[PDB]
Task: inverse folding
């Protein structure tokens, strides 16, 4: 019921409004005859402007083997003596996004952390379905640990980081490693910007979300339908992470909420859950923000701040 | 998981603990494996203790007609010049409860409000399904308005009031009357103790609810399955009230939350929604309380307070 929503575009900060009011004349419109390929194309082209001017550094690309085939990874090396390796899982509702769309986020995260960042181009939905992406990510991370010396990286300590669906993947992967009791490195940290962790409804979901951010409950349902293979996966402890054990041995979690994001309550609940069980974690609300704000670091101090904060939180565990 | 819940029994108020620690040696053990009939019987017997010492006043019983048959109603008349008539809808997850389990609540409401209170013994589920009870309530209310003079009540103004499932019914009923644009009395106020309003999930639902209240999400699913007739009823604007228009012409709502109640967020969302659209309302959180606290007024001043407040809110609209 669109009418019942908070009037968002009026309440966001000035810097968030500047981003909202930014026009890109040379773009088509958001595809109506929406082939997923066209939506992908559109998201890719639209993100380009927001990724410009990213930090220069040494980058490399490597194909890593998984049960599902080779997965492209991209390695950002800010300096030669890294104390840890941080894996970045991009957002996009499971169906959009890639390593270019999140290039500036990842490079900023390497710059600020001074750690190797490794982006994983996991297979998108609906071609892939849960848990393929998670398995690919855990494969990538376990591979690089066992072959750390080949790539000249430090896999004694690792982290996972991601935005939106990426954040879900980040925490799902860390929990997957804990649970199946591998040592693919000491998971020193997990960085989680405006994630969803399996709530089916919430105060924030009812009060927020619209065409301005494409996070209506109808939007979320469609992304979920593209990702999940089975209705029962809705209750899996690697999708609904609140069905997993969050009471012990959870790596330290940096949880960043966007204020005017319907997914905010997923973050709050993740935090209140970890904190009530004495699990290491920090929660920070970024005022004035919509969902997805991380991309707007060139124009929004608060976006760059979120990046710096996560970087700092991670290096502080080392 | 159940493990993910924060420890409620430790955190509640001193006087809520006195209630929690009260033994009734007479009654059986809780029949989870029993018939619906044995559950109703238990709930009735157990609630009896908490209804002792109720205000004595002029009381009457009337059978009122509806499309589903006669419905019993009970009328508590504190004084002969009542300015309004307040309909009370008891809770009990749609499958339990009756006019005796909530007798003391209704009589204190009448005493504190100095308004005629009429309790409605709506048909319980699963015998009845949605929207039968609401239709019986609306019918009973429209009947009394049209026959106000015969029963010597003032139906120029009315309220609806209820606890838990009853609060849902109270508000559904008022919104049903509004949407029909029917005049069965000016709805001056709706009094709502720890209701649920159609959230499918929430922070508080995940974080709270266990054997201590019988409000696990499994319990909630079970009561909903007894109540609804068709899966699509989940989206009805008279079940998921947040799917109705809550931005215009809502009667004034008194919304009482209980601190350690999984349903608390339902109340929060309703308040935030109404307040964002400048709809007359008041929210109050009763600290240290479990769900269902309103029955414990002879041992908890917090319970008595919550009654006085809604009573006072109602009279202030007159």
Result:
């Amino acid at each position: 019921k669109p009418e019942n929503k908070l009037p968002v575009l009026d309440l966001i900060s000035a810097e968030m409004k500047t981003v909202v009011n930014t026009l890109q004349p040379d773009l088509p419109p958001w595809p109506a005859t929406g082939t997923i390929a066209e939506q992908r194309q559109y998201y890719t082209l639209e993100r380009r402007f927001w990724n410009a001017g990213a930090p220069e550094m040494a980058t490399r690309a490597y194909m890593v083997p998984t049960k599902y085939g080779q997965v492209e990874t991209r390695l950002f090396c800010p300096q030669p003596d890294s104390p840890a390796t941080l894996f970045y899982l991009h957002g996009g509702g499971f169906i959009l996004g890639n390593l270019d769309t999140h290039d500036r986020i990842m490079r900023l995260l390497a710059s600020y952390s001074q750690c190797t960042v490794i982006g994983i181009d996991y297979t998108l939905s609906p071609e892939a379905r849960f848990p393929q992406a998670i398995e690919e990510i855990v494969a990538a991370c376990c591979y690089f640990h066992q072959q750390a010396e080949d790539y000249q990286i430090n896999m004694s300590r690792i982290g996972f980081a991601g935005d939106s669906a990426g954040a879900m993947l980040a925490l799902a992967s860390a929990l997957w490693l804990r649970d199946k009791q591998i040592d693919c490195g000491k998971v020193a940290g997990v960085l989680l910007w405006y994630g969803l962790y399996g709530l089916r409804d919430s105060v924030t979901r009812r009060l927020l979300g619209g065409v301005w951010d494409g996070l209506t409950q109808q939007d979320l349902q469609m992304y979920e339908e593209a990702y999940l293979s089975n209705d029962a996966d809705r209750e899996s402890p690697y999708y609904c992470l609140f069905n997993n054990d969050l009471t012990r041995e959870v790596p330290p979690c940096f949880i960043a909420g966007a204020e005017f994001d319907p997914l905010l309550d997923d973050s709050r609940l993740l935090y209140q859950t970890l904190a009530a069980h004495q699990q290491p974690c920090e929660f920070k609300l970024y005022p004035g923000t919509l969902h997805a704000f991380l991309h707007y670091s060139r124009m929004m101090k608060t976006a760059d701040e979120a990046l710096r904060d996560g970087a700092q939180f991670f290096t502080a565990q080392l």
Summary: Chain A has one domain: 1-318.
